[PDB]
Design a protein around this ligand. Structure first.
Ligand SMILES: [Mg+2]
Ligand SMILES: [Mg+2]
Lengths: 136, 137, 135, 136
């Protein structure tokens, strides 16, 4: 609930994500979910359903990036140290893309996070992402 | 150079969701591809402070690697990302444009592998190293 | 049969030999190897602490050999890339299992993802992604 | 000198590494060079002599790991947190493989390192590597 508002305030600070119309769907002590509307991130004909892979990447980087608020009691923006995204299969067209990330380790200066993109069930994610973030 | 530059530029223009970043193609040829992200377009926090958002540089570098496929493909096509890693060596300097360079280092029948880096002043001490793989559709 | 191929491949790997790695199962859906903990000890053997480097070998080997799940006949596919991330330490005094499944196959590249775990696959020690060259 | 003999001692205590016959070629404040003799890497026909990816993974993981001695005053083993390896091209047979690495960021609990593997010419790397390591 407070995380919900902090997550939203992180997000609204991001211009490129404004264009993409990302919204926060949920924010627990369990992690963070964001939503990418397919219509804001089309490559080519909007008639066809096709979401730019680069939008999904932004979604994931941002989800990891913001999920840091589930473990930082205060609000800060943690610069990126490392990021890997690996796509398992292409997105379905005409379907919103969700991202989930979840901090799995926290040290004095670094936060490690892991998540995935999916559409229907989290069971067969579009892609996996792992990132480390500096707090300094 | 020119034909590959024209292609790279047309390619970039299709990426509408990030056109807000003001990304430009500086150079393209058989040996690789250079894009630029103007810093004013990616500030996080106060515009007075000139700090570039990390997620902007991801886009720059995802986009750079993707488009560098033009350097090896005979025909224009847009190649979906399969895998990307970006590893930041050191923080970007504030109030300075960020450049991305990439070069394809392996081409198979359906996959192109590419390596590059972000930097600001000179390529010598890059901000971040990047490797990605792309699907020839 | 697929299983026999997995084992042949593993036996070629003359340098893992020290680790006592075995193939636990192998079907179309993927591959499970095993690292017995007595073969990867750091420090006092009575302390049963598994060396991280052994697990990295385990995961690398599992990915590299998982290519038998999709390849018609025996072939050793060179590494193109490896991504390994550790979620938490291994528990002492327990074997480590490695699982991997090919999730994409192109004419000359095979992409596999896997993880390492001890009791249940539930919360793996580590995640690994890899691509390998074929033909 | 003192780094060199500390690097050698870190490496003597690894078993798999001794079967590979890994040695410390060079070590200073700059970073760490390890050697992998080709004979110990061969998979298959020894005359054909194809060097196994796995032996190079061990090489780099170990090089990255031990390079921490350049930045740690006292002896300690730092477990791998994450590793990335990307081959530019296959190793040549019948040539030893050298692994270099150098810490580029040090944090209270994390050391980040980067390096590469090569044979004759350090400017033609067969592979690139970055890893993060924990100090306990
Ligand atoms: Mg720390
Ligand atoms: Mg192919």
């Amino acid at each position: 609930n407070p995380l919900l508002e902090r997550a939203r305030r992180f997000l609204s600070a991001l211009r490129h994500c404004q264009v993409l119309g990302l919204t926060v769907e949920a924010a627990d002590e369990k992690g963070l979910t964001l939503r990418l509307p397919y219509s804001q991130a089309i490559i080519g004909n909007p008639e066809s359903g096709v979401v730019h892979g680069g939008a999904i990447t932004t979604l994931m980087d941002t989800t990891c990036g913001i999920s840091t608020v589930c473990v930082l009691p205060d609000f800060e923006i943690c610069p990126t140290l490392d990021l890997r995204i690996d796509y398992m299969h292409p997105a379905e067209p005409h379907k919103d893309v969700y991202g989930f990330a979840e901090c799995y380790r926290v040290t004095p200066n670094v936060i490690f996070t892991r998540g995935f993109a999916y559409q229907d069930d989290p069971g067969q994610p579009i892609a996996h992402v792992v990132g480390a973030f500096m707090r300094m």
